[PDB]
Ligand binder design. Structure first.
Ligand SMILES: CCCCCCCCCCCCCCCCCC(=O)OC[C@H](CO[C@@H]1O[C@H](CO[C@H]2O[C@H](CO)[C@H](O)[C@H](O)[C@H]2O)[C@H](O)[C@H](O)[C@H]1O)OC(=O)CCCCCCCCCCCCCCCCC
Ligand SMILES: CCCCCCCCCCCCCCCCCC(=O)OC[C@H](CO[C@@H]1O[C@H](CO[C@H]2O[C@H](CO)[C@H](O)[C@H](O)[C@H]2O)[C@H](O)[C@H](O)[C@H]1O)OC(=O)CCCCCCCCCCCCCCCCC
Ligand code: CLA
Ligand code: CLA
Ligand code: CLA
Ligand code: CLA
Ligand code: CLA
Ligand SMILES: CCCCCCCCCCCCCCCCCC(=O)OC[C@H](CO[C@@H]1O[C@H](CO)[C@H](O)[C@H](O)[C@H]1O)OC(=O)CCCCCCCCCCCCCCCCC
Ligand SMILES: CC1=CCCC(C)(C)[C@H]1/C=C/C(C)=C/C=C/C(C)=C/C=C/C=C(C)/C=C/C=C(C)/C=C/C1=C(C)CCCC1(C)C
Ligand SMILES: CC1=CCCC(C)(C)[C@H]1/C=C/C(C)=C/C=C/C(C)=C/C=C/C=C(C)/C=C/C=C(C)/C=C/C1=C(C)CCCC1(C)C
Ligand SMILES: CC1=CCCC(C)(C)[C@H]1/C=C/C(C)=C/C=C/C(C)=C/C=C/C=C(C)/C=C/C=C(C)/C=C\C1=C(C)CCCC1(C)C
Lengths: 451, 143, 262, 31, 137, 37, 49, 37, 93, 35, 61, 34
């Protein structure tokens, strides 16, 4: 009961994990058990996807969200993004599920029977939240581990099988990225690009060379920073600019992870290179431009001159000019003129969509892709009725992009709220008024009245 | 009518409104078989047209058009990989598969040259790509 | 910008820079040519791009309700970079005593808008649709000029609906928001007939392109043009205003392939 | 002319807000 | 009313012969229609080309007439334009084009029969909903 | 804009009369507070 | 817009304020920082200013 | 679908992804077992 | 246009005004929609149906179909508001 | 246009730098419980 | 054969139920962590051995 | 008839549902450190 009740700790059961702040070994067990939970879900869910996967439909039409990741990494997928084998997915699932047993045993061990505090039996692993050097060493070790993970992706893309390039010549295919871009002006040119329309910040990766080269850069950065933090202590400007408690570190991680959640949501929504449209389905811009393309092809086939056809308002019904002058698909797709997908670039010249290619050389596969991506737009209901809100119940479908984007935007906002809570509490507890205002020395009564 | 019990099934698949059971493969063997007449014709047409597409890519490279040259390799050729896979499996030959892989690697190298705007390497690599494609064509046969 | 330079640029470089709206030109190095029209060979225009660089509107000199004097005025563009017309193509035929170009395709219109001094906005459809241009010779060279008249369609088509749901091909045929005005048996809503009666009226314009550079190797030509047309009428509600555009022109002349299907 | 009335009313509301913020009755503790 | 045989009798051939679909057949047909073609043909319409819907008027006026099970089933394997002069198997899901349309690969003759039965059964269920569009949702 | 004309009087006087009523109630009260001292 | 310039810097002039104003602010902040007791501490935050 | 040798274990894999939710629930029962200390 | 007397021949009656009718109306007449209607709308302005048969460049089978559906076809004065929307009038379903 | 751009950049950088180096100036100590 | 692998996986399933339901009980209950650890660690070893055996026999098909 | 697929899913689900609580009932009976 000691250390596990409100009397001896001051924390209720519903703030129960707040009793783990100064209990290092039990807190380690908490973390390891929760990591076991994460890997358990990964293995169980990807096994569930393998079990429910039918070889007829594509991945995006079946509600599959995890197998697309493995397909992008280059496992069990052939040319055109056709999933030929699903045994590597099974292997990944069983490996994660089995590793979950080990991580769960470790977490339960350290939580229940392991030493409560590691600072007397294992001084190497023990720590104090206020000991800046040890915490920075732990941070640096984890940074080295993250760099090793980035280099693992690099090794997969470069040597072991390679990754799926949807932009590959011919159709999209699994290929070895032999020449990643290591130029700083490109990798950090992405990082300093604007997030608004046309720029996209780091969501605008249009090739796998930039992705793999910048993962090399991230690996180098993380390993160098980890060795920097292992052999260094925070400088005086940093030592006065932060609250050095466990809750403050938690709040910092929370804000960072919330930003990552937002960025990942927009990655799944807008990017179609690290999230190819043949695994995750069309983007919203992709579906809209596909509708415009399908009706352009239909009306051109029926005798219309699409370039010279006038819409109701005087603008192009099929083809118009973007605000910068590029020839683009017309209608309400005008906002989505920044789309670049491997099925529509083939008809794209320096000045936009080439009119000669648009008139004489639209291939049947482009029409098929446009029809498929039109009919499989991200629109859908919570109960998975595909189409607009005013549709009928015949089509059961919500795009994986919608699910991933909505979930990770939700979690990003929630973790911003968590950051605000925990950062405020860290500041208040460090200053020492997180329990209330002292009736003896109230600061406001000492302050001179305003007005 | 006045005492008719509602129908009731207890997690049964028999009823019309039951959701249980598969939708596909329940009523017979599929009509479709791999490499049919029409699909083999389509893949043959794509493979035959790929020669002209490569020739047009070489012409665009000669004129220095970089966007158009890159798009030529993904315009009427986006089905080249699938068509080549399907016809190579019909051939069932190791040398055909080796030439298939060689064409893919040469095409990727040509693209990496075209992004670099290297005219000489672009010309050399489109020539090599065309030669490898014609070698694979003579190998698998029928194109 | 030359056509040889546009081929050099990729779409990523050109996107968002305003170079897509800019009309190309024939280089001075490649000039002094002659695009001769050989007999027993059908020729046609392609890539006829027209970038207007100056927009002027014939505005009344005063806001007097009976003002008849009007002077053209400089205007600034509300719309940005949509003005240029590209891809215009057409057959070259011996319709009359000389050669003539018939406009039959391309982007060939731009629904642009400008603002005059004082803050009044004039929308207009800069177009050469249905042009019947006549070459000033039997051979295109420097100094040759192609000119003729064209029919500008309405800025809004029949399917356009006004803010009260009224259009030409569709919409309400009344001011539904004033049922008491339509209740009257004598006149009803006859006063609002001009605004309710949406009329698609096709106007007239003329263009005079003058080619200052020509090349015989590529068939390309470039020069300047001045065009005169009428502005938006809002399906007959407004009174059209005269629009005088001037700018540069590019184009090419090739041989008919038989697949154009003009 | 109604723009005059609308602007006057909005400006009057903003002025009342200003005077309420900056010319409030100062809070003081009773004895 | 029940799903009587009067609702379940649909024309089979072009001469005028009818066939009574079984409840298993119509259930399988509904599931197959919603899974294989609902994405474009939800509600008896055509999202990609709304000029040509699945309502009985359009099917009857097609060349050949597609208002019967045999004609529909032939369309599912030999699709053609509305006038029956050009083959659109490369742009339409067909069992002969299932490699480029991976939803038609698993369908058998009975599956095509059930899908045609669903198509011909729908208009009997509603006076205007099948192929009516938004106006009758 | 074909707006009403008595609406000007309506708005302006319906704002003015309560406003002067409130101002009078405030000034009266303050005056009384000052007079008490 | 949509060109991809780093921090929107299309003209080189834009960098002069962007780099200098932080540097003047940094110089003013350094006078504050150099006056502080910059030795380490074992606490959640520094109570010495 | 699972590899043939493993399809018999589909009904377990069907309930497999959902255990983490139960873990949270288990916590509450544990705190219900000690009377919410 | 609050009045347009040739509305009945726009696709709602038994007779079709060729000059300013959308392509969709030819779905009503079997065997004319995708192919024949394209050539009908290409050279749209016709003085009469006879000039349509002479000018439309129809093949012999297409002429046979048009001979079948002659009484369902007419050619009135072209309306610019309707000719511009003869292939896509925004009426889908 | 460029003049407005550089003026806005100047203003934005000024206020952002003030925010940055102000919260970096031992903001945690500015509480009533210090000492 | 497939049947033998199914039996092996079912045995692993039952052993995993035993471990999941027994390891917490042995850990928390008094005088059982080291009194009866001989069963716990041997059961973990058997669990992993079953994993490798299932891996190989799965490799055969 | 009850679907065998749904049936086996329900056995698996209910065994899972008694798994965790059975642990807590055990350590309650064995008087372990809750
Ligand atoms: C500083 C002020 C800026 C704040 C950000 C606002 C703009 C965010 C934005 O428009 O975000 C979108 C961008 C992605 O940009 C899109 O990126 C796209 C990248 O796609 C391009 O490249 C892709 C590569 O394949 C595809 O090819 C695609 O077709 C092609 O268009 C295009 O550039 C689009 O035009 C562009 O809009 O996301 C990003 O950069 C990633 C970051 C997203 C952050 C979103 C969080 C927003 C804050 C929520 C606050 C919650 C409430 C808190 C209150 C308490
Ligand atoms: C303190 C208080 C706390 C209290 C909170 C308590 C939580 C209460 C939860 C409500 C009760 C749950 C209802 C469960 C049924 C359900 O919904 O049922 C849905 C399914 C089970 O139903 C199946 O749902 C399927 C859904 O379709 C999927 O499958 C289809 C088949 O291909 C298509 O692929 C389609 O695109 C795809 O979505 C089909 O409809 C099946 O026929 C149907 O049986 O459950 C699922 O999968 C399970 C869902 C797993 C979670 C998914 C994460 C959330 C998704 C991200 C969005 C988050 C952003 C916020 C959103 C707001
Ligand atoms: C990710 C979820 C998570 C994790 C990892 C933890 C972890 C922890 N919590 Mg808990 N907790 C959680 C959620 C979580 N909590 C939630 C949602 C609540 C709100 C109800 C609480 C409320 C709470 C309180 C009130 C307290 C804790 C405490 C603790 C710590 C000590 C546990 C202890 O001794 O209990 C003993 C528990 C038991 C003996 C019951 C048996 C539990 C078994 C082991 C679970 C079975 C797991 C699995 C099936 C076994 C697999 C074995 C493997 C070999 C295969 C531990 C590190 C305590 C703490 O801080 O101590 C300092 C504490 O006081 N937690
Ligand atoms: C966050 C992770 C974490 C951390 C920080 C700790 C920390 C600790 N654990 Mg451990 N533990 C963990 C996870 C963790 N554990 C897990 C997952 C389990 C379950 C298997 C355990 C099970 C466990 C037990 C049973 C015990 C500890 C104990 C200890 C302490 C001593 C460690 C020691 O002597 O290492 C020595 C290190 C080794 C023996 C490992 C050698 C390396 C081998 C050969 C593996 C090589 C892997 C290879 C490099 C990976 C390649 C990567 C490639 C795929 C890319 C220490 C406090 C002890 C304790 O607290 O006693 C009271 C103790 O008895 N832990
Ligand atoms: C998990 C990652 C991590 C964490 C938690 C820390 C934590 C720390 N580092 Mg850092 N560091 C890391 C990785 C990390 N480092 C890596 C990989 C490197 C590269 C080698 C460094 C290099 C480094 C140095 C050289 C120093 C620190 C120092 C510090 C301390 C001060 C941090 C600070 O005030 O930043 C302040 C951050 C800024 C002023 C802005 C960062 C500039 C980038 C380029 C911004 C670019 C814009 C961006 C893209 C905008 C959008 C982002 C979006 C996600 C919101 C702190 C202990 C200091 C210390 O005391 O070390 C002993 C120190 O001097 N670190
Ligand atoms: C209910 C909890 C939950 C669940 C189920 C998921 C599920 C998911 N999240 Mg996560 N997420 C959550 C909460 C959750 N999230 C929360 C609260 C946040 C904070 C807001 C996030 C933030 C987040 C982000 C930022 C992203 C995801 C993403 C994902 C997806 C991929 C998971 C993954 O691989 O991560 C990554 C896995 C790891 C970091 C583990 C280590 C990976 C190693 C290093 C990989 C090695 C690879 C190598 C090639 C292997 C071979 C080596 C050798 C043979 C060559 C998945 C659908 C991704 C996505 O698709 O977003 C759209 C994504 O980008 N999530
Ligand atoms: C990295 C993730 C992380 C970590 C490690 C912690 C850790 C901690 N948090 Mg938590 N927290 C997080 C994320 C995290 N938090 C986020 C994202 C939020 C914002 C929503 C919060 C909000 C929060 C609050 C408000 C409080 C804590 C507290 C705590 C402490 C005790 C929590 C406990 O025992 O819960 C035991 C678990 C339960 C009782 C189960 C509750 C389950 C809920 C009801 C389900 C979710 C409901 C609903 C959908 C949420 C909507 C959120 C909205 C913003 C969208 C502990 C230090 C408490 C504390 O004492 O801090 C010192 C405290 O007061 N946290
Ligand atoms: C937060 C999460 C949302 C993600 C935001 C994306 C982050 C990318 C940052 C780079 C922005 C960029 O490049 O600017 C680019 C854009 C503007 O840049 C645009 O660039 C265009 C071409 O790239 C053109 O040049 C435009 O003229 C130019 O405006 O930035 C802005 O939108 C203005 C920035 C506003 C910053 C607000 C200040 C935030 C207040 C505190 C700041 C935190 C300080 C921390 C100190 C450490
Ligand atoms: C081999 C094979 C072939 C075909 C497919 C098949 C799936 C059958 C596969 C078999 C896979 C098997 C048997 C995998 C085994 C995996 C196992 C047993 C995983 C177990 C993982 C354990 C985990 C997470 C433990 C985490 C526990 C936690 C946080 C507990 C939390 C708690 C703690 C620590 C204290 C307070 C109470 C509370 C909150 C409940
Ligand atoms: C080992 C193995 C073999 C086969 C494969 C598999 C992956 C499954 C793997 C399984 C591993 C594991 C670790 C399985 C364990 C399952 C567990 C721990 C299940 C837990 C179930 C918990 C349940 C019901 C809890 C229900 C509690 C409730 C409502 C409590 C009620 C309530 C209370 C007490 C107070 C508040 C109000 C509320 C919420 C109503
Ligand atoms: C990996 C990959 C994939 C696709 C291609 C791509 C090129 C993008 C490639 C490369 C990506 C790269 C290199 C990404 C790198 C991202 C970087 C460097 C992001 C930077 C994040 C930095 C942030 C938030 C800093 C915020 C720090 C703050 C407030 C610090 C604290 C404080 C300060 C500074 C003053 C006020 C007080 C306070 C609050 C204490």
């Amino acid at each position: 009961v000691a250390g596990r009740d409100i009397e001896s700790t001051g924390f209720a059961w519903w703030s129960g994990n707040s009793r783990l702040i100064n209990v290092s070994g039990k807190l380690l067990g908490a973390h390891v058990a929760h990591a076991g939970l994460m890997v358990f879900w990964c293995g169980a869910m990807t096994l569930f996807e393998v079990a429910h996967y039918i070889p007829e439909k594509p991945l995006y039409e079946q509600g599959l969200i995890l197998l697309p990741h493995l397909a992008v990494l280059g496992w069990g997928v052939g040319p055109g993004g056709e999933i030929i084998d699903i045994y590597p997915y099974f292997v990944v699932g069983v490996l994660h599920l089995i590793s979950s047993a080990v991580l769960g045993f470790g977490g339960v061990y350290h939580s229940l029977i392991g030493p409560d505090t590691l600072e007397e039996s294992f001084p190497a692993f023990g720590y104090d939240w206020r000991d800046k050097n040890k915490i920075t060493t732990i941070l640096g070790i984890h940074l080295i581990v993250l760099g090793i993970g980035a280099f693992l992706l690099v090794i997969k893309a470069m040597y072991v099988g390679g990754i799926y390039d949807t932009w590959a010549p011919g159709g999209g295919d699994v290929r070895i990225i032999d020449s990643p871009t290591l130029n700083p002006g490109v990798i950090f040119g992405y990082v300093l690009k604007s997030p608004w329309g046309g720029d996209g910040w780091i969501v605008s990766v249009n090739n796998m060379e930039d992705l793999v080269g910048g993962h090399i850069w991230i690996g180098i950065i993380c390993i160098v920073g980890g060795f920097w933090h292992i052999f260094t202590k925070p400088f005086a400007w940093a030592r006065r600019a932060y609250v050095w408690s466990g809750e403050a570190y938690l709040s910092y991680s929370l804000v960072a992870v919330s930003l990552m959640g937002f960025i990942a949501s927009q990655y799944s929504w807008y990017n179609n290179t690290a999230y190819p449209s043949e695994f995750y389905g069309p983007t919203g811009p992709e579906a809209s431009q596909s509708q415009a393309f399908t009706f352009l092809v239909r009306d051109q086939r029926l005798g219309a001159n699409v370039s010279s056809a006038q819409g109701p308002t005087g603008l192009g019904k099929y083809l118009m000019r973007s605000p910068s002058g590029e020839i683009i698909l017309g209608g309400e797709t005008q906002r989505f003129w920044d789309l670049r997908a491997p099925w529509i670039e083939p008809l794209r010249g320096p000045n936009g969509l080439d009119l000669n290619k648009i008139k004489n050389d639209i291939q049947p596969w482009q029409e098929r892709r446009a029809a498929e991506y039109m009919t499989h737009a991200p629109l859908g209901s919570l109960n998975s009725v595909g189409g607009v809100a005013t549709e009928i119940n015949s089509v059961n479908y919500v795009s994986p992009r919608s699910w991933l984007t909505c979930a990770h935007f939700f979690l990003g906002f929630a973790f911003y709220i968590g950051h605000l809570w925990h950062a405020g509490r860290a500041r208040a507890a460090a200053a020492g008024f997180e329990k209330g205002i002292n009736r003896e020395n109230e600061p406001t009564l000492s302050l001179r009245p305003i007005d | 009518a006045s005492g008719d019990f509602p129908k009731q099934s207890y997690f049964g698949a028999a009823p019309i409104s039951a959701p249980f059971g598969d939708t596909y493969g329940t009523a017979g063997a599929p009509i479709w078989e791999k490499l049919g007449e029409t699909e083999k014709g389509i893949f043959t047409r794509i493979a035959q047209t790929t020669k002209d597409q490569l020739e047009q890519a070489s012409e665009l490279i000669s004129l220095g058009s970089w966007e158009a040259s890159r798009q030529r390799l993904r315009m009427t050729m986006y089905e080249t990989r699938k068509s080549m896979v399907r016809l190579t499996d019909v051939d069932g030959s190791k040398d055909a598969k080796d030439l298939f892989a060689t064409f893919k690697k040469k095409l990727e190298a040509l693209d990496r040259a075209l992004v670099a705007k290297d005219k000489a390497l672009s010309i050399k690599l489109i020539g090599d790509v065309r030669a490898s494609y014609n070698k694979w064509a003579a190998t698998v046969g029928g194109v | 910008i030359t056509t040889e330079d546009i081929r050099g640029l990729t779409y990523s470089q050109v996107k968002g820079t305003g170079l897509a709206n800019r009309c190309p030109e024939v280089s001075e190095q490649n000039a002094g040519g002659t695009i001769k029209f050989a007999d027993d060979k059908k020729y046609k225009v392609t890539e006829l791009c027209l970038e207007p660089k100056s927009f002027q509107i014939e505005e009344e000199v005063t806001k007097r309700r009976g003002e008849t004097k009007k002077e053209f005025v400089d205007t600034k563009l509300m719309t940005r970079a949509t003005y240029s017309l590209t891809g215009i193509e057409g057959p070259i035929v011996f319709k009359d005593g000389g050669l003539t170009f018939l406009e039959k395709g391309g982007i060939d219109y731009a629904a642009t808008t400008v603002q005059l001094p004082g803050g009044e906005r004039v929308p207009f459809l800069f177009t050469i649709k249905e042009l019947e241009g006549k070459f000033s010779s039997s051979q295109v060279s420097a100094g040759t000029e192609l000119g003729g008249n064209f029919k500008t369609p309405s800025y809004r088509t029949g399917l356009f609906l006004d803010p009260k749901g009224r259009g030409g091909t569709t919409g309400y045929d009344m001011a539904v928001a004033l049922p008491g005005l339509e209740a009257d048996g004598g006149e009803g809503q006859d006063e609002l007939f001009a605004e309710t009666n949406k009329v698609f009226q096709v106007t007239d314009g003329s263009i005079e392109m003058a080619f200052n550079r020509v090349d015989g190797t590529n068939g390309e030509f470039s020069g300047v043009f001045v065009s005169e047309q009428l502005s938006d009428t809002d399906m007959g509600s407004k009174a059209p205003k005269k629009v005088l555009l001037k700018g540069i022109v590019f184009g090419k002349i090739e041989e008919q392939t038989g697949d154009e299907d003009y | 002319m109604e723009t005059l009335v609308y602007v006057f009313l909005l400006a009057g509301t903003l002025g009342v807000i200003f005077f309420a913020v900056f010319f409030r009755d100062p809070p003081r503790i009773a004895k | 009313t029940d799903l009587d045989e009067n609702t379940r009798t649909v024309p089979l051939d072009s001469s005028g012969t009818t066939v009574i679909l079984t409840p298993e057949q119509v259930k399988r047909g509904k599931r197959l229609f919603n899974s294989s073609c609902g994405n474009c043909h939800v509600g008896g319409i055509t999202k990609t080309n709304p000029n040509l819907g699945l309502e009985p008027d359009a099917l009857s006026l097609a060349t050949p007439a597609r208002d019967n099970i045999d004609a529909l089933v032939d369309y599912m394997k030999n699709p053609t334009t509305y006038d029956g002069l050009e083959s659109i198997a490369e742009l339409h899901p067909s069992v002969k084009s299932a490699d480029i349309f991976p939803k038609m690969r698993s369908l058998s003759d009975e599956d095509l029969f059930a899908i045609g039965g669903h198509i011909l059964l729908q208009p009997k269920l509603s006076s205007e909903k099948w192929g009516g569009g938004k106006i009758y949702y | 804009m074909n707006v009403s004309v008595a609406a000007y009087l309506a708005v302006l006087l319906g704002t003015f009369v309560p406003v002067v009523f409130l101002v009078t109630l405030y000034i009266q009260s303050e005056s009384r507070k000052a007079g008490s001292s | 817009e949509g060109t991809g310039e780093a921090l929107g810097i299309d003209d080189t002039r834009l960098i002069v304020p962007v780099i200098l104003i932080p540097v003047i602010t940094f110089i003013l902040y350094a006078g504050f920082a150099s006056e502080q007791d910059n030795e380490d501490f074992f606490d959640t935050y520094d109570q010495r200013r | 679908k699972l590899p043939e040798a493993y399809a018999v274990f589909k009904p377990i894999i069907d309930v497999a992804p959902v255990i983490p939710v139960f873990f949270l629930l288990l916590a509450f029962v544990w705190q219900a077992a000690v009377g919410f200390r | 246009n609050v009045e347009y007397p040739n509305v009945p021949y726009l696709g709602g009656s038994d007779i079709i005004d060729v000059n300013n009718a959308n392509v969709r109306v030819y779905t009503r007449l079997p065997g004319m929609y995708p192919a024949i209607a394209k050539k009908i709308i290409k050279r749209a302005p016709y003085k009469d149906i006879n000039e349509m048969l002479e000018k439309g460049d129809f093949t012999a089978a297409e002429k046979d179909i048009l001979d079948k559906y002659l009484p369902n076809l007419t050619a009135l004065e072209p309306a610019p508001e309707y000719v511009i929307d003869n292939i896509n009038n925004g009426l889908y379903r | 246009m460029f003049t407005l751009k550089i003026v806005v950049y100047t203003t934005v950088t000024f206020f952002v730098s003030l925010f940055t180096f102000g919260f970096l100036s031992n903001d945690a100590s500015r509480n009533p419980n210090r000492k | 054969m497939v049947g033998l692998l199914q039996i092996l996986v079912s045995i692993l399933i039952l052993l995993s139920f035993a471990l999941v339901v027994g390891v917490p009980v042995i850990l928390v209950s008094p005088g059982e962590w080291e009194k009866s650890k001989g069963l716990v660690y041997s059961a973990a070893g058997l669990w992993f051995g079953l994993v490798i055996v299932i891996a190989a026999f799965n490799s055969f098909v | 008839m009850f679907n065998p697929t749904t049936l086996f899913q329900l056995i698996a689900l209910f065994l899972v549902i008694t798994s965790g609580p059975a642990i807590i009932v055990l350590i309650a009976f064995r008087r372990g450190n809750l």
